[PDB]
Amino acid sequence: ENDYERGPDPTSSSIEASRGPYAVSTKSISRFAARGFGGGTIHYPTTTADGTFGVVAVSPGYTASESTIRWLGPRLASFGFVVITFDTNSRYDQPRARGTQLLAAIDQAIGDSTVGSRIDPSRQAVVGHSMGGGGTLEAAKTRPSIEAAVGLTPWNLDKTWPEVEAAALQIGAQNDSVAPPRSHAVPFYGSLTNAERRAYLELRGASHFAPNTSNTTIAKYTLAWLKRYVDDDTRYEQFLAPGPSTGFGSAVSDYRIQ
Ligand SMILES: [Ca+2]
Ligand SMILES: [Ca+2]
Predict the structure, then answer these.
(1) How far is the CA of 53 from the centre of ligand 2 (A)?
(2) Position 53 in a domain
């Protein structure tokens, strides 16, 4: 029995679609209207007919504006999430600061006059690119009750993450020269000893900037992870285990889950 399931039973096709079954509404937050972060956009299912949803914040990476990760906002929201994409206080904020701002973005959405009543505040998640992906681990360390964390080509100087209890997925890029997975994503995966679930998924042939353009592999597995752990939706376990193929023509070069 699960109170939190939303949407029809999934298929490979459904989770790859550019939009899920929900129409999406949006609310802008200016830099000066934002408490603890640099402004952003809340993307939310228009309908209230199906109940409340979990809340997901999405951080950009080092040097970068919200525009580099904004595509995740409407896409994820359209599958049944309230999603806040945002700018940081400084484009050069480090992972610790990005973690704090992920939590600030969640908290502003939770209290918002438009979307607060659409969120289940007990069910929170964090997603981020680059140092924002490092920030997901920072946020899940600070706020252990986070349900799920997804790092996209994550960067963090701290390689050890025994504090994280959330379900944590790292998506690496095989040819990343900025945050190479051998020294960032893969160490994080290995050290996530206390995580509810941990996974590593590597994009074949990809560069560090793969998460900044719509990418079906990133979207489908981010979605499946968030459904599995923000909504406890066991219908999405089928995509995670045994997980994507790594054979001829696959977009995935490595996949691990524990
Ligand atoms: Ca550490
Ligand atoms: Ca959960």
Answers:
(1) 12
(2) yes
What is the rounded distance in angstroms from the CA atom of residue 34 to the CA atom of residue 103?
12
Q: Which ligand is nearest to the CA of 226?
A: 2
- Give catalytic status of residue 208 as yes or no: yes
In 32-95, beta strands by DSSP E = 40-45, 53-59, 82-86
Is 158 among the residues known to form the active site?
A: no
Sign of the four-CA dihedral 249, 79, 147, 101: positive
Dist. CA 198 → ligand 1 center (Å) = 16
Query: Is 6 domain-assigned?
Result: no
Are residues 91 and 46 in contact, defined by beta-carbon separation less than 8 angstroms? no
Which listed residue (43, 129, 184, 208) is catalytic? 208
For residue 147, give the ligand nearest its CA: 2
Residue 66 DSSP code? G
The active-site residue, picked from 93, 176, 231, 233, is 176
Residue 59, strand partner residues: 128
Question: ω before 242 within 30° of 0 (cis)?
Answer: yes
Phi/psi at 41 (5° precision): -140, 130
Structural domain for 178, as ranges: 12-257
Measured in angstroms, how far is the CA atom of residue 162 from the centroid of ligand 1? 7
Tell me how far apart the alpha carbons of residues 87 and 73 are, in angstroms, rounded to a whole number. Answer: 13
Report if residue 189 sits inside a domain.
Answer: yes
CA of 73 to the centre of ligand 2 (A): 20
CATH number of residue 180's parent domain: 3.40.50.1820
Residue 135 resides in a domain: yes
Please count the structural domains in the chain: 1
